Design an enzyme around this catalytic site. Structure first.
Site, PDB file in Angstrom:
ATOM      1  N   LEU A 164       0.934  -1.416  -0.066  1.00 32.95           N
ATOM      2  CA  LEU A 164      -0.026  -0.122   0.254  1.00 32.95           C
ATOM      3  C   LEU A 164       0.848   1.253  -0.002  1.00 32.95           C
ATOM      4  O   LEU A 164       1.391   1.740   1.050  1.00 32.95           O
ATOM      5  CB  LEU A 164      -1.164   0.086   1.117  1.00 32.95           C
ATOM      6  N   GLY A 198       6.253   1.650   1.568  1.00 32.67           N
ATOM      7  CA  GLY A 198       6.209   1.623   3.259  1.00 32.67           C
ATOM      8  C   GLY A 198       6.386   3.070   4.062  1.00 32.67           C
ATOM      9  O   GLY A 198       6.987   3.835   3.574  1.00 32.67           O
ATOM     10  N   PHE A 225       3.903   2.558   7.026  1.00 31.00           N
ATOM     11  CA  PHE A 225       3.176   1.702   8.005  1.00 31.00           C
ATOM     12  C   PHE A 225       3.860   0.531   8.691  1.00 31.00           C
ATOM     13  O   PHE A 225       3.018  -0.372   9.509  1.00 31.00           O
ATOM     14  CB  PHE A 225       1.600   1.667   7.669  1.00 31.00           C
ATOM     15  N   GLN A 251       5.104  -2.766   6.377  1.00 33.88           N
ATOM     16  CA  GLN A 251       4.681  -4.004   5.662  1.00 33.88           C
ATOM     17  C   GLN A 251       3.243  -4.333   5.745  1.00 33.88           C
ATOM     18  O   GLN A 251       2.572  -4.875   6.516  1.00 33.88           O
ATOM     19  CB  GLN A 251       5.283  -5.383   6.039  1.00 33.88           C
ATOM     20  N   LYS A 285      -1.614  -5.999   7.333  1.00 30.93           N
ATOM     21  CA  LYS A 285      -0.408  -5.603   8.037  1.00 30.93           C
ATOM     22  C   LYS A 285      -0.044  -7.043   8.477  1.00 30.93           C
ATOM     23  O   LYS A 285      -0.567  -8.024   9.115  1.00 30.93           O
ATOM     24  CB  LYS A 285      -0.425  -4.870   9.275  1.00 30.93           C
ATOM     25  N   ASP A 287       1.781  10.837  17.363  1.00 34.54           N
ATOM     26  CA  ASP A 287       2.231  11.446  16.363  1.00 34.54           C
ATOM     27  C   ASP A 287       0.987  11.935  15.399  1.00 34.54           C
ATOM     28  O   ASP A 287       0.803  11.684  14.196  1.00 34.54           O
ATOM     29  CB  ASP A 287       3.137  10.359  15.557  1.00 34.54           C
ATOM     30  N   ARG A 297       0.137  13.211   7.453  1.00 34.25           N
ATOM     31  CA  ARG A 297       0.680  12.093   7.030  1.00 34.25           C
ATOM     32  C   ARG A 297       0.035  10.637   7.596  1.00 34.25           C
ATOM     33  O   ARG A 297       0.114   9.778   7.024  1.00 34.25           O
ATOM     34  CB  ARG A 297       2.167  12.102   7.081  1.00 34.25           C
ATOM     35  N   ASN A 298      -0.229  11.043   8.899  1.00 30.84           N
ATOM     36  CA  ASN A 298      -1.221   9.852   9.657  1.00 30.84           C
ATOM     37  C   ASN A 298      -2.539   9.812   9.431  1.00 30.84           C
ATOM     38  O   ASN A 298      -3.410   9.287  10.166  1.00 30.84           O
ATOM     39  CB  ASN A 298      -0.722   9.779  11.097  1.00 30.84           C
ATOM     40  N   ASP A 332      -2.331   4.552  12.981  1.00 33.61           N
ATOM     41  CA  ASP A 332      -1.200   4.410  13.876  1.00 33.61           C
ATOM     42  C   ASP A 332      -1.499   5.042  15.207  1.00 33.61           C
ATOM     43  O   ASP A 332      -0.489   5.906  15.913  1.00 33.61           O
ATOM     44  CB  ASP A 332      -0.004   5.096  13.319  1.00 33.61           C
TER      45      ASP A 332
HETATM   46  C1  LIG Z   1       2.906   6.823   3.550  1.00 33.74           C
HETATM   47  C2  LIG Z   1       1.455   7.031   3.801  1.00 33.74           C
HETATM   48  C3  LIG Z   1       0.800   6.885   2.382  1.00 33.74           C
HETATM   49  O1  LIG Z   1       0.464   7.648   1.713  1.00 33.74           O
HETATM   50  N1  LIG Z   1       0.211   5.652   1.873  1.00 33.74           N
HETATM   51  C4  LIG Z   1      -0.682   5.487   0.995  1.00 33.74           C
HETATM   52  C5  LIG Z   1      -0.632   6.018  -0.123  1.00 33.74           C
HETATM   53  C6  LIG Z   1      -1.295   5.612  -1.375  1.00 33.74           C
HETATM   54  C7  LIG Z   1      -2.667   4.869  -1.191  1.00 33.74           C
HETATM   55  C8  LIG Z   1      -2.644   4.531   0.016  1.00 33.74           C
HETATM   56  C9  LIG Z   1      -1.869   4.478   1.026  1.00 33.74           C
HETATM   57  C10 LIG Z   1      -2.347   3.612   2.331  1.00 33.74           C
HETATM   58  O2  LIG Z   1      -1.150   3.717   3.285  1.00 33.74           O
HETATM   59  N2  LIG Z   1      -3.318   3.059   2.550  1.00 33.74           N
HETATM   60  C11 LIG Z   1      -3.674   2.509   3.721  1.00 33.74           C
HETATM   61  C12 LIG Z   1      -3.129   2.003   4.896  1.00 33.74           C
HETATM   62  C13 LIG Z   1      -3.788   1.376   5.564  1.00 33.74           C
HETATM   63  C14 LIG Z   1      -3.665   0.630   7.064  1.00 33.74           C
HETATM   64  C15 LIG Z   1      -2.492   1.224   7.877  1.00 33.74           C
HETATM   65  C16 LIG Z   1      -2.701   0.695   9.281  1.00 33.74           C
HETATM   66  C17 LIG Z   1      -3.400   1.578  10.338  1.00 33.74           C
HETATM   67  C18 LIG Z   1      -3.282   1.177  11.629  1.00 33.74           C
HETATM   68  O3  LIG Z   1      -4.014   1.771  12.459  1.00 33.74           O
HETATM   69  C19 LIG Z   1      -3.800   1.756  14.047  1.00 33.74           C
HETATM   70  C20 LIG Z   1      -3.154  -0.158  11.832  1.00 33.74           C
HETATM   71  C21 LIG Z   1      -2.423  -1.296  10.767  1.00 33.74           C
HETATM   72  O4  LIG Z   1      -2.280  -2.313  11.130  1.00 33.74           O
HETATM   73  C22 LIG Z   1      -2.173  -2.860  12.307  1.00 33.74           C
HETATM   74  C23 LIG Z   1      -2.255  -0.668   9.743  1.00 33.74           C
HETATM   75  N3  LIG Z   1      -5.170   1.406   5.066  1.00 33.74           N
HETATM   76  N4  LIG Z   1      -4.956   1.790   3.784  1.00 33.74           N
END
Ligand SMILES: *CCC(=O)Nc1ccccc1C(=O)Nc1cc(CCc2cc(OC)cc(OC)c2)n[nH]1
Length: 271
Positions: free
Chosen positions: A20, A23, A25, A27, A50, A149, A153-154, A167
């Site tokens: 996604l 990196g 978040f 893996q 995750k 945090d 970005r979060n 997060d």
């Molecule tokens: C660098 C961040 C970013 O811009 N990522 C991104 C970019 C383009 C399309 C999609 C994304 C993206 O990250 N999508 C996404 C991530 C997640 C889950 C992340 C996550 C959050 C938690 O909160 C407590 C917990 C966990 O796992 C334990 C994972 N969903 N969509």
């Protein structure tokens, strides 16, 4: 690992896809889950998964288990990344959470910036973004959860343009003074970060304290200085940012007050 009847999802109903948006978040891959909505067990849905890297340690595993356990107790809210299920038996640990396809809020606003210099993302749209984050934060606070945090970005954006806090459980420019080197972390320190997040929203993904080196920041704040009103910001919102940035943590608004104030602006705001 124990089997939780309330959360266990069968791994043969989950087909893993591409990582996604790279990196940030640790893996996380996009996946297609079959029967995630038990009403339609045939139906496919896009989810986020995750997992641990092949090279992960015993601590890295315990950390993911702790995050999974906290997400089991938090309950649900539309403005947070929610736990969907887990794969713990006869295979590696998989934590299935909601997918936010449009990525982080910072990149979302930076990509929708007006082209060319100043001589499509209106004030009500921006206040909506802020209000949604405040509601998600007010929820997490009620579930005894401190972010640590809270930055654009979060905050993740779904296909339906819904804001989702990711997060929850150094980024020095978002940190309250009492957390900088007294190393605290409270609901009041989250409000400070919320103020910086408001500034990022109204600058359309602008970097806070632009130009100021991380070492010069502590002195800036000790002298009583704060960031100036962004060029295109409603005055009521700068007033809110300033309340979030009080030196005394007890003088800052609560997420309940922030939700109230953000709502009034959402109804009233022009432009
Ligand atoms: C660098 C961040 C970013 O811009 N990522 C991104 C970019 C383009 C399309 C999609 C994304 C993206 O990250 N999508 C996404 C991530 C997640 C889950 C992340 C996550 C959050 C938690 O909160 C407590 C917990 C966990 O796992 C334990 C994972 N969903 N969509």
């Amino acid at each position: 690992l124990p089997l939780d009847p309330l959360w266990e999802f069968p791994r043969d109903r989950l087909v893993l896809g591409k990582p996604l948006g790279e990196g940030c978040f640790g893996q996380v891959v996009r996946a297609e889950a079959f029967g995630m909505d038990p009403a339609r067990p045939d139906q496919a849905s896009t989810v986020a998964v995750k997992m641990l890297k092949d090279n992960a340690s015993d601590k890295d595993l315990a950390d993911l288990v702790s995050e999974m356990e906290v997400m089991k107790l938090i309950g649900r809210h539309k403005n947070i990344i929610n736990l969907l299920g887990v794969c713990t038996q006869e295979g590696p640990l998989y934590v299935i959470v909601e997918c936010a396809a449009k990525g982080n809020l910072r990149e979302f606003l930076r990509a929708r910036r007006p082209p060319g210099p100043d001589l499509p993302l209106s004030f009500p749209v921006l206040v909506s973004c802020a209000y949604q984050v405040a509601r998600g934060m007010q929820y997490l606070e009620s579930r005894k959860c401190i972010h640590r945090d809270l930055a654009a970005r979060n905050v993740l954006v779904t296909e339906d343009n819904v804001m989702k806090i990711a997060d929850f459980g150094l980024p020095v420019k978002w940190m309250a003074p009492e957390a900088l080197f007294d190393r605290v972390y409270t609901h009041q320190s989250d409000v400070w970060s919320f103020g910086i997040l408001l500034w990022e929203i109204f600058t359309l993904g602008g970097s806070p304290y632009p130009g100021i080196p991380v070492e010069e920041l502590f002195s800036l704040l000790r002298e009583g200085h704060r960031m100036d009103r962004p060029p295109h910001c409603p005055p009521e919102l700068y007033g809110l940012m300033r309340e979030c940035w009080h030196a005394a943590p007890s003088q800052r608004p609560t997420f309940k007050q922030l939700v109230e104030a953000l709502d009034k602006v959402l109804l009233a705001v022009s432009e």
